[PDB]
């Protein structure tokens, strides 16, 4: 029986570009194809991994095999040709700067530079500014941005900004610009639209990165006179020292600049996003918010301000931060990895140079590893009696794992806990007067961001009477 | 057999569709330049020709110098205190007089208005220059500059960079403007009283923050005031009360007058600057001529001064054309008949609200050539060597008893901001090509949608520094 012919197929993708969130689109495909599959774009083959078993083989068991980074035209501009840490390929450059960066956080282990003290100082500044807005609905994005930017500038240069220093608006402006132009889908851009049609994405990215580089360069030069081999106390000292003791090819001035830029961008954008997400979920869940005010008042009161040691007491607050980092991870697909050598994932072959994506969203929403994964439930991280924190699932990796794992996790966890505890001790946070709630859908950029929203700020009466 | 339906109400256009001032203007084709509308028991008269407008504001200004009472205006003005929304009477008359007498304290000296103004503009230009090569919204830096100028006129104080109080003011200013009215204070249908809403409660909560902030300043000034140092607006008001009428100089009355001056000085000037920048982004040809004008007449050996209004004629005509096309108050503030009177020989009863449609006057096709078009040249002789007044149908600052009292301040603020900015900065379209929408948002002030501008330090200024 004759039959019409099937049309020649020159290309095929399993979902529509720019429709839906990529991480969720990859996760939905796991019903059809399993937890690991590949897609080819020209000559580049990419592998997506969506189960914690296989993710741990990529990140840990074989971490060094898959520690590379793929080269992207956008990340080249941002990383000054793959310098820095996050977007540098595995190699001597990345191995050294990563280690020196991790070593700087020991300069702030304890003493007067104890991170908790640096953080609580800026948090005090932030809470004071916020209190002037008593009774008003405001967007707290910038006040937080300034606080974390000062904590990071103290770690990097032992310098901090003064209220109103226009530099803070200049950085805000080129951070905004680069994040808006770098990627529209969690750094996983299947189709290379940038190279098919005429656009100015790369030209915009250069403009913003020029202002960033020139600003950092001005600081790094004015610091060449301040430096003393006897006084290493910040990240810039650590780097400048190794350059003197040298290799010196690796610690060039552009290499140092770009490595500082990564720490700054990483430390400000991630932390500020997660605070905003946490506020948003509490506006949608006043029942959790009420319980957090009760916990913070019974365990800390108002005689003092929260300290890191309160982490052992404010368990629901720690469970909320954990639940927010599960639901809305800062990087729902981490940063793309790359196979440094021929290797394998779950017995499947993977050739050298293959881009490997870990779908963190899939891991955090596996219906077999989590009860009601779509729901904001801080209790999932506490025992039934709410007296002890737990780890309900092994499919939980907000900070990654292995050689490319996060180096600022300690800082981030202290900033988050303290910001939230200080804010909750002093302020009622309510829906703005016109009743709008933030959309919890999110915008998947290099960072998984939430749409800007306003919050009604009111100084709590319990905290007022206590004065 | 078939009859017409009983008709219980009729309005000549659809509420909340289009801009009111323009809907009123369109109706003149059909009804003439003056007609009336009756809402319940309140009759309102709309006036749309310069001849009749000048009879209401000037020839009969005293007959029509009242203000209609509105629930929303009552909250903003603490029950019709202040000046702008105060009914004609002793209170309004005295405070307006004292507010105007305050500007003579700044006619010359170390505190000459041009010195106060140029100081702030210098700070603004230094802040804006840090943004070299970036696209920004210049709303807040201007708001802060002008808030400092007015604060210096009222208290001889200014805010330092970063003072969170400026964000607090910006917040409740935005809140009050957003909830005061949706259409130039000419809200025909009283929706606020028909359906459940929280408009008046949002306004109260914003005004409370304003009143509390102002009260703190005023009661901390009682410990500063001296009879021998009268140098600002608060001094002028306190002296009058010391020399006393004193019943009209209550603390609330002084607060509300100061509130009116701060709000009027800051939100009007900030809007006009944003409107001027928008039009030049749409008219690069005018923008180039301005750069050429200022370069040849002021150069880069010094910053512009007020005396430069004699040479920067295109800049002065551009400002005039922006106040014609996008008046801060397209329908002024509503007036009211204090007595039984007449307009154009028609009877107007006492208590009748009377609205002057300035938009109609400024777009009259018989009085202006291509009134829809942005044409700074219309205010210069064909040779571009002297400013002219091409029509009598031009009243951006009102006229008569309720006319603007800050015109002089505003005209110097506007001229100097633009001159300094054009001397030093290239102002161009942001990187993604978006241009501002010139349609506007008719609120208590005729506002322009928020937009951004790429700011760059000019090479001429650079080289010459
Ligand atoms: C809640 C906050 C944060 C979360 C959830 C987070 C998560 C992550 C993730 C998902 C990655 C990619 C992991 C991978 O490729 O396997 C990463 C890497 C990185 N993180 Fe963060 N991060 C946070 C905060 C911070 C802070 C405060 C800093 C700096 C002080 C920082 C510095 C970095 C850097 C420099 C990298 C690049 C590391 C590399 O490629 O070797 N992060 N982090
Ligand atoms: C471009 C800037 C400005 C424009 C176009 C403008 C225009 C106007 C207009 C049209 C009126 C209403 C006239 C009427 O109701 O018949 C008015 C009134 C008023 N203006 Fe302005 N004005 C400006 C700036 C200022 C400034 C800088 C101040 C104070 C420093 C100020 C203070 C006032 C006050 C207090 C009134 C109320 C007068 C009264 O009701 O007796 N304005 N202005
Ligand atoms: C964790 N995490 C995240 C996975 C990463 C950490 C840092 C890293 C980059 C580093 C560069 C920087 C440039 C800054 O724009 C100018 O400076 C904007 C913000 C970035 C793009 C951040 C965004 C988060 C990241 C991808
Ligand atoms: C000319 N003109 C202008 C068109 C008018 C002059 C002043 C007047 C009022 C006075 C009160 C003030 C309260 C401020 O909110 C807190 O302070 C917000 C801004 C206002 C509402 C301004 C708006 C402009 C005006 C109607």
Author numbering:
A (entry chain A): 28 to 273, 283 to 503
B (entry chain B): 30 to 273, 283 to 503
From the paper:
It was found that successful ligation of the heme iron by the isonitrile functionality for a given P450 depends on both the position and stereochemistry of the isonitrile on the steroid skeleton.
Co-crystallization of CYP17A1 with the tighter-binding epimer of 1 and subsequent X-ray diffraction analysis revealed that this is the 20-(R) epimer and confirmed formation of a bond between the carbon atom of the isonitrile functionality and the heme Fe. The positioning of 1 in the active site is well-defined by the electron density, rising ~60° to the heme normal, orienting the C20 isonitrile group directly above the Fe. The C3 formyl ester substituent projects between N202, R239, and several waters, components that typically interact with both steroidal and nonsteroidal CYP17A1 ligands. The position of the heme-ligating isonitrile of 1 is similar to that of the pyridine nitrogen of abiraterone in those structures. As is typical for CYP17A1 structures, two of the four monomers in the asymmetric unit have a slightly different conformation of the F/G and N-terminal regions. Indeed, a second copy of 1 is bound in this peripheral site. Binding of this second copy of the ligand is also consistent with the steep slope observed in the inhibition experiment, suggesting a 2:1 stoichiometry, while the spectral shift binding assay only reports on the ligand molecule binding in the active site where it can cause a spin shift.
